């Protein structure tokens, strides 16, 4: 069961609101493993508060380092589980166009496109 | 009560900004 599956919409709307009261600048990002992934390590945490000046490239490096991937290992971060957005895009721009109706930004990571 | 939310730190952002490959917007 994913975060969307185990937390009601109404509760998630409230979560976003609680987060923004404490962190008016940060982008709330849900980062989950693709359900068919068997190769990448499992990230220990799923909920990330990301400064609004970070770009996708920087976020990708941050997650790869947290997974302690070697430079040779493959890693993709799919926004909304499908959209491949340019790695140069600032996260605030990703948030503005790809955020969910509940106000969270959803990503899935895997070894494939 | 335990923290739910990882605050991505300035240290890890700066480590990622100091690694190639560097992406340039505009």
Swiss-Prot record, chain A:
SUPFAM superfamilies found in the cross-reference section: Ubiquitin-like
Bilayer topology term: Lipid-anchor
GO biological process: autophagy; cellular response to starvation; establishment of localization in cell; mitophagy; mucus secretion; positive regulation of mucus secretion
Signal sequence range: none
GO cellular component terms listed in the entry, alphabetical order: autolysosome; autophagosome; autophagosome membrane; axoneme; cytoplasmic vesicle; endomembrane system; membrane; microtubule
Modifications made to the protein after synthesis: The precursor molecule is cleaved by ATG4 (ATG4A, ATG4B, ATG4C or ATG4D) to expose the glycine at the C-terminus and form the cytosolic form, LC3-I. The processed form is then activated by APG7L/ATG7, transferred to ATG3 and conjugated to phosphatidylethanolamine (PE) phospholipid to form the membrane-bound form, LC3-II. During non-canonical autophagy, the processed form is conjugated to phosphatidylserine (PS) phospholipid. ATG4 proteins also mediate the delipidation of PE-conjugated forms. Phosphorylation by PKA inhibits conjugation of phosphatidylethanolamine (PE). Interaction with MAPK15 reduces the inhibitory phosphorylation and increases autophagy activity.
Pfam families named in the record: ATG8
Keyword line: Autophagy, Cytoplasm, Cytoplasmic vesicle, Cytoskeleton, Lipoprotein, Membrane, Microtubule, Mitochondrion, Phosphoprotein, Ubl conjugation, Ubl conjugation pathway
Subunit field text: 3 different light chains, LC1 (a cleavage product of MAP1B), LC2 (a cleavage product of MAP1A) and LC3 (produced by one of the MAP1LC3 genes), can associate with the MAP1A or MAP1B heavy chains. Interacts at microtubules with CABP1 (via EF-hands 1 and 2) but not with calmodulin. Interacts with FYCO1 (via C-terminus). Interacts with TP53INP1 and TP53INP2. Interacts with TBC1D25. Directly interacts with SQSTM1; this interaction leads to MAP1LC3B recruitment to inclusion bodies containing polyubiquitinated protein aggregates and to inclusion body degradation by autophagy.
Similarity annotation: Belongs to the ATG8 family.
Name of protein: Microtubule-associated protein 1 light chain 3 beta
Organism: Mus musculus
From Swiss-Prot, chain B:
Residue ranges of coiled coil: none
Domain of life from the UniProt record: Eukaryota
Subcellular location per the Swiss-Prot or TrEMBL entry: Cytoplasm, Cytoskeleton; Membrane; Cytoplasm, Myofibril, Sarcomere, M line; Apical cell membrane
Entry comment on modification after translation: Phosphorylated at multiple sites by different protein kinases and each phosphorylation event regulates the protein's structure and function.
Phosphoserine modification, residue list: 9
UniProt note on tissues of expression: Present in plasma membrane of neurons as well as glial cells throughout the brain. Expressed in fetal brain and in temporal cortex of adult brain. Also expressed in the inner segments of rod photoreceptors in retina.
Function: Plays an essential role in the localization and membrane stabilization of ion transporters and ion channels in several cell types, including cardiomyocytes, as well as in striated muscle cells. In skeletal muscle, required for proper localization of DMD and DCTN4 and for the formation and/or stability of a special subset of microtubules associated with costameres and neuromuscular junctions.
Subunit structure: Interacts with RHBG and SPTBN1. Colocalizes with Na/K ATPase, Na/Ca exchanger and SPTBN1. Directly interacts with DMD; this interaction is necessary for DMD localization at the sarcolemma. Interacts with DCTN4; this interaction is required for DCTN4 retention at costameres. Identified in complexes that contain VIM, EZR, AHNAK, BFSP1, BFSP2, ANK2, PLEC, PRX and spectrin. Interacts (via death domain) with RABGAP1L (via Rab-GAP TBC domain).
This protein's domain notes: The tandem configuration of the two ZU5 and the UPA domains forms a structural supramodule termed ZZU. ZU5-1 mediates interaction with beta-spectrin, and the ZU5-1/UPA interface is required for ankyrin's function other than binding to spectrin.
Disorder cited: Long QT syndrome 4: A heart disorder characterized by a prolonged QT interval on the ECG and polymorphic ventricular arrhythmias. They cause syncope and sudden death in response to exercise or emotional stress, and can present with a sentinel event of sudden cardiac death in infancy. Long QT syndrome type 4 shows many atypical features compared to classical long QT syndromes, including pronounced sinus bradycardia, polyphasic T waves and atrial fibrillation.
Protein name, entry field: Ankyrin-2
Source organism (scientific name): Homo sapiens
Gene name as annotated: ANK2
Region of the whole protein represented: 1588 to 1613 of 3957
